[PDB]
Amino acid sequence: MVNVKVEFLGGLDAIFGKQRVHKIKMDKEDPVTVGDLIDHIVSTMINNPNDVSIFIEDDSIRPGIITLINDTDWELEGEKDYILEDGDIISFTSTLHGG
């Protein structure tokens, strides 16, 4: 029903499959929060102790991963306090290389 064009960079797209930009689709309820989107990526999209383990750590994202929502900072709004919106442009980045 919905669609979100996310752009993974730094060291995230490498896990997805060298995909600088990937679209996601979720179908559950109307008031779908951003936290749900990430969940979808870690549920059906990804399912292995290597790709998701590094991204999510015990229901908690790994401190350091960047996430630009609508050309803005994730923490700026409220992390998971941002309702989704089909037709948005999300961006992900990682300031970590080697070690």
PDB file of N, CA and C in Angstrom:
ATOM      1  N   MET A   1       0.834  -1.234   0.000  1.00  0.00           N
ATOM      2  CA  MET A   1       0.000   0.000   0.000  1.00  0.00           C
ATOM      3  C   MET A   1       0.858   1.269   0.000  1.00  0.00           C
ATOM      4  N   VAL A   2       1.961   1.247   0.753  1.00  0.00           N
ATOM      5  CA  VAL A   2       2.862   2.402   0.837  1.00  0.00           C
ATOM      6  C   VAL A   2       4.227   2.105   0.210  1.00  0.00           C
ATOM      7  N   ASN A   3       5.024   3.160   0.013  1.00  0.00           N
ATOM      8  CA  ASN A   3       6.357   3.024  -0.575  1.00  0.00           C
ATOM      9  C   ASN A   3       7.294   4.127  -0.079  1.00  0.00           C
ATOM     10  N   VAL A   4       8.498   3.736   0.337  1.00  0.00           N
ATOM     11  CA  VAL A   4       9.491   4.689   0.833  1.00  0.00           C
ATOM     12  C   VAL A   4      10.857   4.441   0.191  1.00  0.00           C
ATOM     13  N   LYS A   5      11.377   5.452  -0.506  1.00  0.00           N
ATOM     14  CA  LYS A   5      12.677   5.344  -1.167  1.00  0.00           C
ATOM     15  C   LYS A   5      13.806   5.704  -0.200  1.00  0.00           C
ATOM     16  N   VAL A   6      14.484   4.679   0.321  1.00  0.00           N
ATOM     17  CA  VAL A   6      15.586   4.883   1.260  1.00  0.00           C
ATOM     18  C   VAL A   6      16.933   4.779   0.554  1.00  0.00           C
ATOM     19  N   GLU A   7      17.877   5.624   0.961  1.00  0.00           N
ATOM     20  CA  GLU A   7      19.209   5.623   0.371  1.00  0.00           C
ATOM     21  C   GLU A   7      20.269   5.285   1.417  1.00  0.00           C
ATOM     22  N   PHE A   8      20.748   4.042   1.388  1.00  0.00           N
ATOM     23  CA  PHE A   8      21.766   3.587   2.333  1.00  0.00           C
ATOM     24  C   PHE A   8      23.170   3.875   1.808  1.00  0.00           C
ATOM     25  N   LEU A   9      24.003   4.461   2.670  1.00  0.00           N
ATOM     26  CA  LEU A   9      25.374   4.811   2.307  1.00  0.00           C
ATOM     27  C   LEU A   9      26.343   4.507   3.450  1.00  0.00           C
ATOM     28  N   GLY A  10      27.636   4.711   3.190  1.00  0.00           N
ATOM     29  CA  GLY A  10      28.655   4.465   4.198  1.00  0.00           C
ATOM     30  C   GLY A  10      29.021   2.997   4.312  1.00  0.00           C
ATOM     31  N   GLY A  11      28.256   2.262   5.121  1.00  0.00           N
ATOM     32  CA  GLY A  11      28.507   0.841   5.310  1.00  0.00           C
ATOM     33  C   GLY A  11      27.233   0.041   5.547  1.00  0.00           C
ATOM     34  N   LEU A  12      26.114   0.527   5.005  1.00  0.00           N
ATOM     35  CA  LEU A  12      24.823  -0.145   5.155  1.00  0.00           C
ATOM     36  C   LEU A  12      24.414  -0.833   3.854  1.00  0.00           C
ATOM     37  N   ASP A  13      24.548  -0.109   2.742  1.00  0.00           N
ATOM     38  CA  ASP A  13      24.206  -0.639   1.419  1.00  0.00           C
ATOM     39  C   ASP A  13      25.043  -1.875   1.080  1.00  0.00           C
ATOM     40  N   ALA A  14      26.237  -1.970   1.673  1.00  0.00           N
ATOM     41  CA  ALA A  14      27.127  -3.106   1.433  1.00  0.00           C
ATOM     42  C   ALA A  14      26.469  -4.412   1.868  1.00  0.00           C
ATOM     43  N   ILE A  15      25.713  -4.348   2.963  1.00  0.00           N
ATOM     44  CA  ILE A  15      25.020  -5.515   3.494  1.00  0.00           C
ATOM     45  C   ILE A  15      23.769  -5.833   2.674  1.00  0.00           C
ATOM     46  N   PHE A  16      23.044  -4.787   2.278  1.00  0.00           N
ATOM     47  CA  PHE A  16      21.821  -4.948   1.491  1.00  0.00           C
ATOM     48  C   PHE A  16      22.113  -5.567   0.122  1.00  0.00           C
ATOM     49  N   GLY A  17      23.303  -5.292  -0.412  1.00  0.00           N
ATOM     50  CA  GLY A  17      23.684  -5.820  -1.713  1.00  0.00           C
ATOM     51  C   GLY A  17      24.127  -4.727  -2.669  1.00  0.00           C
ATOM     52  N   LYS A  18      24.982  -3.826  -2.182  1.00  0.00           N
ATOM     53  CA  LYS A  18      25.487  -2.712  -2.986  1.00  0.00           C
ATOM     54  C   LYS A  18      24.337  -1.865  -3.540  1.00  0.00           C
ATOM     55  N   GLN A  19      23.262  -1.736  -2.758  1.00  0.00           N
ATOM     56  CA  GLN A  19      22.103  -0.952  -3.173  1.00  0.00           C
ATOM     57  C   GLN A  19      22.103   0.414  -2.491  1.00  0.00           C
ATOM     58  N   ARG A  20      22.593   1.429  -3.205  1.00  0.00           N
ATOM     59  CA  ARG A  20      22.646   2.791  -2.671  1.00  0.00           C
ATOM     60  C   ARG A  20      21.244   3.299  -2.327  1.00  0.00           C
ATOM     61  N   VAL A  21      20.240   2.834  -3.079  1.00  0.00           N
ATOM     62  CA  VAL A  21      18.854   3.237  -2.850  1.00  0.00           C
ATOM     63  C   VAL A  21      17.905   2.048  -3.013  1.00  0.00           C
ATOM     64  N   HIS A  22      17.054   1.828  -2.011  1.00  0.00           N
ATOM     65  CA  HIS A  22      16.102   0.721  -2.038  1.00  0.00           C
ATOM     66  C   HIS A  22      14.736   1.157  -1.505  1.00  0.00           C
ATOM     67  N   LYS A  23      13.669   0.705  -2.168  1.00  0.00           N
ATOM     68  CA  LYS A  23      12.306   1.048  -1.765  1.00  0.00           C
ATOM     69  C   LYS A  23      11.717  -0.017  -0.838  1.00  0.00           C
ATOM     70  N   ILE A  24      10.947   0.431   0.158  1.00  0.00           N
ATOM     71  CA  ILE A  24      10.319  -0.473   1.125  1.00  0.00           C
ATOM     72  C   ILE A  24       8.795  -0.322   1.120  1.00  0.00           C
ATOM     73  N   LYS A  25       8.090  -1.424   1.395  1.00  0.00           N
ATOM     74  CA  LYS A  25       6.625  -1.423   1.428  1.00  0.00           C
ATOM     75  C   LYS A  25       6.100  -2.132   2.682  1.00  0.00           C
ATOM     76  N   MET A  26       5.243  -1.441   3.440  1.00  0.00           N
ATOM     77  CA  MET A  26       4.668  -1.999   4.666  1.00  0.00           C
ATOM     78  C   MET A  26       3.138  -2.001   4.611  1.00  0.00           C
ATOM     79  N   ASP A  27       2.529  -3.057   5.154  1.00  0.00           N
ATOM     80  CA  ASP A  27       1.073  -3.182   5.172  1.00  0.00           C
ATOM     81  C   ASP A  27       0.588  -3.724   6.518  1.00  0.00           C
ATOM     82  N   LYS A  28       0.074  -2.831   7.368  1.00  0.00           N
ATOM     83  CA  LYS A  28      -0.423  -3.226   8.687  1.00  0.00           C
ATOM     84  C   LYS A  28      -1.570  -2.324   9.147  1.00  0.00           C
ATOM     85  N   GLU A  29      -1.248  -1.070   9.449  1.00  0.00           N
ATOM     86  CA  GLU A  29      -2.246  -0.101   9.910  1.00  0.00           C
ATOM     87  C   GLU A  29      -2.034   1.261   9.248  1.00  0.00           C
ATOM     88  N   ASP A  30      -2.863   2.239   9.617  1.00  0.00           N
ATOM     89  CA  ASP A  30      -2.759   3.583   9.052  1.00  0.00           C
ATOM     90  C   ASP A  30      -1.636   4.383   9.717  1.00  0.00           C
ATOM     91  N   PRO A  31      -1.684   4.565  11.055  1.00  0.00           N
ATOM     92  CA  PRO A  31      -0.655   5.318  11.783  1.00  0.00           C
ATOM     93  C   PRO A  31       0.668   4.554  11.899  1.00  0.00           C
ATOM     94  N   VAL A  32       1.279   4.255  10.753  1.00  0.00           N
ATOM     95  CA  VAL A  32       2.549   3.534  10.725  1.00  0.00           C
ATOM     96  C   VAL A  32       3.708   4.466  11.073  1.00  0.00           C
ATOM     97  N   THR A  33       4.388   4.178  12.182  1.00  0.00           N
ATOM     98  CA  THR A  33       5.521   4.996  12.618  1.00  0.00           C
ATOM     99  C   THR A  33       6.807   4.559  11.927  1.00  0.00           C
ATOM    100  N   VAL A  34       7.796   5.449  11.913  1.00  0.00           N
ATOM    101  CA  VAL A  34       9.085   5.162  11.283  1.00  0.00           C
ATOM    102  C   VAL A  34       9.748   3.928  11.893  1.00  0.00           C
ATOM    103  N   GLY A  35       9.545   3.730  13.198  1.00  0.00           N
ATOM    104  CA  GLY A  35      10.109   2.573  13.870  1.00  0.00           C
ATOM    105  C   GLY A  35       9.638   1.270  13.249  1.00  0.00           C
ATOM    106  N   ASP A  36       8.439   1.295  12.661  1.00  0.00           N
ATOM    107  CA  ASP A  36       7.879   0.114  12.010  1.00  0.00           C
ATOM    108  C   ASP A  36       8.646  -0.197  10.729  1.00  0.00           C
ATOM    109  N   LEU A  37       8.954   0.852   9.962  1.00  0.00           N
ATOM    110  CA  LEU A  37       9.701   0.705   8.716  1.00  0.00           C
ATOM    111  C   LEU A  37      10.991  -0.068   8.962  1.00  0.00           C
ATOM    112  N   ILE A  38      11.775   0.388   9.942  1.00  0.00           N
ATOM    113  CA  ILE A  38      13.030  -0.278  10.285  1.00  0.00           C
ATOM    114  C   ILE A  38      12.769  -1.737  10.663  1.00  0.00           C
ATOM    115  N   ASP A  39      11.672  -1.970  11.393  1.00  0.00           N
ATOM    116  CA  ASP A  39      11.293  -3.319  11.812  1.00  0.00           C
ATOM    117  C   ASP A  39      11.091  -4.223  10.602  1.00  0.00           C
ATOM    118  N   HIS A  40      10.403  -3.702   9.587  1.00  0.00           N
ATOM    119  CA  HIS A  40      10.140  -4.459   8.366  1.00  0.00           C
ATOM    120  C   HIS A  40      11.446  -4.906   7.708  1.00  0.00           C
ATOM    121  N   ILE A  41      12.454  -4.035   7.751  1.00  0.00           N
ATOM    122  CA  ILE A  41      13.759  -4.335   7.168  1.00  0.00           C
ATOM    123  C   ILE A  41      14.481  -5.431   7.954  1.00  0.00           C
ATOM    124  N   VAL A  42      14.198  -5.519   9.252  1.00  0.00           N
ATOM    125  CA  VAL A  42      14.841  -6.510  10.113  1.00  0.00           C
ATOM    126  C   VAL A  42      13.993  -7.779  10.291  1.00  0.00           C
ATOM    127  N   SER A  43      12.760  -7.779   9.777  1.00  0.00           N
ATOM    128  CA  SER A  43      11.887  -8.943   9.912  1.00  0.00           C
ATOM    129  C   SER A  43      11.884  -9.799   8.644  1.00  0.00           C
ATOM    130  N   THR A  44      11.160  -9.357   7.616  1.00  0.00           N
ATOM    131  CA  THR A  44      11.082 -10.105   6.359  1.00  0.00           C
ATOM    132  C   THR A  44      12.260  -9.779   5.441  1.00  0.00           C
ATOM    133  N   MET A  45      12.593  -8.492   5.331  1.00  0.00           N
ATOM    134  CA  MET A  45      13.699  -8.053   4.480  1.00  0.00           C
ATOM    135  C   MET A  45      15.007  -8.754   4.864  1.00  0.00           C
ATOM    136  N   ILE A  46      15.364  -8.699   6.151  1.00  0.00           N
ATOM    137  CA  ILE A  46      16.588  -9.335   6.637  1.00  0.00           C
ATOM    138  C   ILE A  46      16.281 -10.346   7.740  1.00  0.00           C
ATOM    139  N   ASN A  47      16.998 -11.470   7.731  1.00  0.00           N
ATOM    140  CA  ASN A  47      16.799 -12.512   8.737  1.00  0.00           C
ATOM    141  C   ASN A  47      18.045 -13.391   8.874  1.00  0.00           C
ATOM    142  N   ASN A  48      19.089 -12.851   9.508  1.00  0.00           N
ATOM    143  CA  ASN A  48      20.335 -13.590   9.701  1.00  0.00           C
ATOM    144  C   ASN A  48      21.237 -12.908  10.733  1.00  0.00           C
ATOM    145  N   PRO A  49      21.887 -13.696  11.615  1.00  0.00           N
ATOM    146  CA  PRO A  49      22.787 -13.159  12.641  1.00  0.00           C
ATOM    147  C   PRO A  49      24.123 -12.712  12.049  1.00  0.00           C
ATOM    148  N   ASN A  50      24.084 -11.620  11.292  1.00  0.00           N
ATOM    149  CA  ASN A  50      25.282 -11.073  10.655  1.00  0.00           C
ATOM    150  C   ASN A  50      24.986  -9.718  10.018  1.00  0.00           C
ATOM    151  N   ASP A  51      23.857  -9.635   9.310  1.00  0.00           N
ATOM    152  CA  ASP A  51      23.444  -8.394   8.651  1.00  0.00           C
ATOM    153  C   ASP A  51      22.567  -7.554   9.576  1.00  0.00           C
ATOM    154  N   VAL A  52      21.653  -8.211  10.285  1.00  0.00           N
ATOM    155  CA  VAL A  52      20.759  -7.517  11.202  1.00  0.00           C
ATOM    156  C   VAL A  52      21.406  -7.343  12.577  1.00  0.00           C
ATOM    157  N   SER A  53      22.196  -8.335  12.996  1.00  0.00           N
ATOM    158  CA  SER A  53      22.876  -8.289  14.289  1.00  0.00           C
ATOM    159  C   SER A  53      23.732  -7.025  14.424  1.00  0.00           C
ATOM    160  N   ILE A  54      24.382  -6.626  13.328  1.00  0.00           N
ATOM    161  CA  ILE A  54      25.228  -5.439  13.323  1.00  0.00           C
ATOM    162  C   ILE A  54      24.396  -4.153  13.303  1.00  0.00           C
ATOM    163  N   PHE A  55      23.217  -4.215  12.682  1.00  0.00           N
ATOM    164  CA  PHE A  55      22.328  -3.059  12.590  1.00  0.00           C
ATOM    165  C   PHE A  55      21.551  -2.859  13.893  1.00  0.00           C
ATOM    166  N   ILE A  56      20.807  -3.889  14.303  1.00  0.00           N
ATOM    167  CA  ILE A  56      20.015  -3.835  15.532  1.00  0.00           C
ATOM    168  C   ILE A  56      20.659  -4.675  16.636  1.00  0.00           C
ATOM    169  N   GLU A  57      20.708  -4.114  17.844  1.00  0.00           N
ATOM    170  CA  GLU A  57      21.295  -4.796  18.994  1.00  0.00           C
ATOM    171  C   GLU A  57      20.299  -4.871  20.154  1.00  0.00           C
ATOM    172  N   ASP A  58      19.615  -6.014  20.271  1.00  0.00           N
ATOM    173  CA  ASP A  58      18.626  -6.230  21.333  1.00  0.00           C
ATOM    174  C   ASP A  58      17.570  -5.125  21.336  1.00  0.00           C
ATOM    175  N   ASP A  59      16.771  -5.081  20.268  1.00  0.00           N
ATOM    176  CA  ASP A  59      15.710  -4.080  20.125  1.00  0.00           C
ATOM    177  C   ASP A  59      16.249  -2.653  20.283  1.00  0.00           C
ATOM    178  N   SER A  60      17.522  -2.454  19.935  1.00  0.00           N
ATOM    179  CA  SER A  60      18.151  -1.142  20.039  1.00  0.00           C
ATOM    180  C   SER A  60      19.185  -0.959  18.931  1.00  0.00           C
ATOM    181  N   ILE A  61      19.014   0.087  18.123  1.00  0.00           N
ATOM    182  CA  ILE A  61      19.936   0.360  17.020  1.00  0.00           C
ATOM    183  C   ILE A  61      21.352   0.609  17.535  1.00  0.00           C
ATOM    184  N   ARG A  62      22.342   0.310  16.696  1.00  0.00           N
ATOM    185  CA  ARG A  62      23.742   0.502  17.063  1.00  0.00           C
ATOM    186  C   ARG A  62      24.138   1.974  16.945  1.00  0.00           C
ATOM    187  N   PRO A  63      24.509   2.613  18.076  1.00  0.00           N
ATOM    188  CA  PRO A  63      24.911   4.026  18.097  1.00  0.00           C
ATOM    189  C   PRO A  63      26.010   4.332  17.081  1.00  0.00           C
ATOM    190  N   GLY A  64      25.708   5.228  16.141  1.00  0.00           N
ATOM    191  CA  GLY A  64      26.674   5.593  15.116  1.00  0.00           C
ATOM    192  C   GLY A  64      26.064   5.639  13.722  1.00  0.00           C
ATOM    193  N   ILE A  65      25.003   4.857  13.507  1.00  0.00           N
ATOM    194  CA  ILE A  65      24.326   4.811  12.211  1.00  0.00           C
ATOM    195  C   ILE A  65      23.528   6.089  11.968  1.00  0.00           C
ATOM    196  N   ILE A  66      23.802   6.736  10.838  1.00  0.00           N
ATOM    197  CA  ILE A  66      23.126   7.975  10.469  1.00  0.00           C
ATOM    198  C   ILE A  66      21.810   7.695   9.735  1.00  0.00           C
ATOM    199  N   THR A  67      20.835   8.592   9.914  1.00  0.00           N
ATOM    200  CA  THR A  67      19.525   8.460   9.279  1.00  0.00           C
ATOM    201  C   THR A  67      18.908   9.834   9.008  1.00  0.00           C
ATOM    202  N   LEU A  68      18.999  10.291   7.760  1.00  0.00           N
ATOM    203  CA  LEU A  68      18.442  11.585   7.379  1.00  0.00           C
ATOM    204  C   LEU A  68      17.009  11.430   6.880  1.00  0.00           C
ATOM    205  N   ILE A  69      16.069  12.007   7.623  1.00  0.00           N
ATOM    206  CA  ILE A  69      14.656  11.944   7.263  1.00  0.00           C
ATOM    207  C   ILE A  69      14.190  13.270   6.663  1.00  0.00           C
ATOM    208  N   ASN A  70      13.906  13.259   5.358  1.00  0.00           N
ATOM    209  CA  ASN A  70      13.460  14.460   4.645  1.00  0.00           C
ATOM    210  C   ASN A  70      14.517  15.563   4.727  1.00  0.00           C
ATOM    211  N   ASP A  71      15.778  15.189   4.492  1.00  0.00           N
ATOM    212  CA  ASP A  71      16.889  16.138   4.548  1.00  0.00           C
ATOM    213  C   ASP A  71      17.035  16.727   5.959  1.00  0.00           C
ATOM    214  N   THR A  72      16.630  15.950   6.967  1.00  0.00           N
ATOM    215  CA  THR A  72      16.712  16.378   8.360  1.00  0.00           C
ATOM    216  C   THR A  72      17.284  15.256   9.225  1.00  0.00           C
ATOM    217  N   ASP A  73      17.652  15.585  10.460  1.00  0.00           N
ATOM    218  CA  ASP A  73      18.213  14.598  11.383  1.00  0.00           C
ATOM    219  C   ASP A  73      17.114  13.747  12.020  1.00  0.00           C
ATOM    220  N   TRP A  74      17.414  12.465  12.243  1.00  0.00           N
ATOM    221  CA  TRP A  74      16.455  11.538  12.850  1.00  0.00           C
ATOM    222  C   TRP A  74      16.106  11.969  14.273  1.00  0.00           C
ATOM    223  N   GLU A  75      17.140  12.220  15.079  1.00  0.00           N
ATOM    224  CA  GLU A  75      16.957  12.647  16.468  1.00  0.00           C
ATOM    225  C   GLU A  75      16.238  13.999  16.543  1.00  0.00           C
ATOM    226  N   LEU A  76      16.346  14.793  15.471  1.00  0.00           N
ATOM    227  CA  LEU A  76      15.705  16.108  15.407  1.00  0.00           C
ATOM    228  C   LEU A  76      14.213  16.008  15.737  1.00  0.00           C
ATOM    229  N   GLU A  77      13.518  15.079  15.079  1.00  0.00           N
ATOM    230  CA  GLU A  77      12.087  14.883  15.310  1.00  0.00           C
ATOM    231  C   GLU A  77      11.842  14.140  16.627  1.00  0.00           C
ATOM    232  N   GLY A  78      12.155  12.844  16.643  1.00  0.00           N
ATOM    233  CA  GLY A  78      11.966  12.038  17.844  1.00  0.00           C
ATOM    234  C   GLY A  78      12.238  10.557  17.615  1.00  0.00           C
ATOM    235  N   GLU A  79      13.231  10.260  16.771  1.00  0.00           N
ATOM    236  CA  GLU A  79      13.620   8.888  16.451  1.00  0.00           C
ATOM    237  C   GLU A  79      12.444   8.077  15.897  1.00  0.00           C
ATOM    238  N   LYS A  80      11.626   7.523  16.791  1.00  0.00           N
ATOM    239  CA  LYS A  80      10.466   6.722  16.393  1.00  0.00           C
ATOM    240  C   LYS A  80       9.157   7.516  16.508  1.00  0.00           C
ATOM    241  N   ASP A  81       9.252   8.802  16.868  1.00  0.00           N
ATOM    242  CA  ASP A  81       8.067   9.649  17.002  1.00  0.00           C
ATOM    243  C   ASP A  81       7.748  10.381  15.692  1.00  0.00           C
ATOM    244  N   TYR A  82       8.075   9.749  14.561  1.00  0.00           N
ATOM    245  CA  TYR A  82       7.813  10.324  13.244  1.00  0.00           C
ATOM    246  C   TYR A  82       6.962   9.363  12.416  1.00  0.00           C
ATOM    247  N   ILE A  83       5.700   9.733  12.195  1.00  0.00           N
ATOM    248  CA  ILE A  83       4.782   8.900  11.420  1.00  0.00           C
ATOM    249  C   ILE A  83       5.236   8.804   9.964  1.00  0.00           C
ATOM    250  N   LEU A  84       5.164   7.596   9.400  1.00  0.00           N
ATOM    251  CA  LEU A  84       5.569   7.366   8.016  1.00  0.00           C
ATOM    252  C   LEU A  84       4.687   8.158   7.045  1.00  0.00           C
ATOM    253  N   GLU A  85       5.040   8.119   5.759  1.00  0.00           N
ATOM    254  CA  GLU A  85       4.293   8.833   4.731  1.00  0.00           C
ATOM    255  C   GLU A  85       4.723   8.375   3.341  1.00  0.00           C
ATOM    256  N   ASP A  86       3.915   7.510   2.733  1.00  0.00           N
ATOM    257  CA  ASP A  86       4.206   6.988   1.395  1.00  0.00           C
ATOM    258  C   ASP A  86       4.599   8.118   0.448  1.00  0.00           C
ATOM    259  N   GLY A  87       5.815   8.028  -0.088  1.00  0.00           N
ATOM    260  CA  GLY A  87       6.322   9.050  -0.987  1.00  0.00           C
ATOM    261  C   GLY A  87       7.412   9.894  -0.340  1.00  0.00           C
ATOM    262  N   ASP A  88       8.029   9.357   0.718  1.00  0.00           N
ATOM    263  CA  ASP A  88       9.088  10.057   1.435  1.00  0.00           C
ATOM    264  C   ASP A  88      10.465   9.625   0.938  1.00  0.00           C
ATOM    265  N   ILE A  89      11.482  10.429   1.251  1.00  0.00           N
ATOM    266  CA  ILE A  89      12.853  10.128   0.847  1.00  0.00           C
ATOM    267  C   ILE A  89      13.764  10.001   2.069  1.00  0.00           C
ATOM    268  N   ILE A  90      13.958   8.766   2.530  1.00  0.00           N
ATOM    269  CA  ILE A  90      14.805   8.502   3.692  1.00  0.00           C
ATOM    270  C   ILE A  90      16.254   8.240   3.276  1.00  0.00           C
ATOM    271  N   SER A  91      17.197   8.594   4.149  1.00  0.00           N
ATOM    272  CA  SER A  91      18.617   8.390   3.867  1.00  0.00           C
ATOM    273  C   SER A  91      19.338   7.778   5.064  1.00  0.00           C
ATOM    274  N   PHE A  92      20.215   6.816   4.790  1.00  0.00           N
ATOM    275  CA  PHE A  92      20.993   6.159   5.835  1.00  0.00           C
ATOM    276  C   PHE A  92      22.482   6.262   5.523  1.00  0.00           C
ATOM    277  N   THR A  93      23.290   6.447   6.561  1.00  0.00           N
ATOM    278  CA  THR A  93      24.738   6.563   6.396  1.00  0.00           C
ATOM    279  C   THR A  93      25.468   5.933   7.579  1.00  0.00           C
ATOM    280  N   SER A  94      26.774   5.733   7.424  1.00  0.00           N
ATOM    281  CA  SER A  94      27.587   5.136   8.477  1.00  0.00           C
ATOM    282  C   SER A  94      28.991   5.734   8.488  1.00  0.00           C
ATOM    283  N   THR A  95      29.364   6.343   9.614  1.00  0.00           N
ATOM    284  CA  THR A  95      30.686   6.949   9.759  1.00  0.00           C
ATOM    285  C   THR A  95      31.663   5.965  10.415  1.00  0.00           C
ATOM    286  N   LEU A  96      31.772   4.771   9.827  1.00  0.00           N
ATOM    287  CA  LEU A  96      32.665   3.735  10.340  1.00  0.00           C
ATOM    288  C   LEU A  96      33.280   2.933   9.191  1.00  0.00           C
ATOM    289  N   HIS A  97      34.613   2.844   9.174  1.00  0.00           N
ATOM    290  CA  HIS A  97      35.319   2.112   8.124  1.00  0.00           C
ATOM    291  C   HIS A  97      36.549   1.386   8.672  1.00  0.00           C
ATOM    292  N   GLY A  98      36.471   0.056   8.718  1.00  0.00           N
ATOM    293  CA  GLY A  98      37.583  -0.747   9.199  1.00  0.00           C
ATOM    294  C   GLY A  98      37.773  -0.668  10.703  1.00  0.00           C
ATOM    295  N   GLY A  99      37.480  -1.770  11.396  1.00  0.00           N
ATOM    296  CA  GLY A  99      37.632  -1.809  12.842  1.00  0.00           C
ATOM    297  C   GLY A  99      36.448  -1.203  13.568  1.00  0.00           C
TER     298      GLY A  99
END
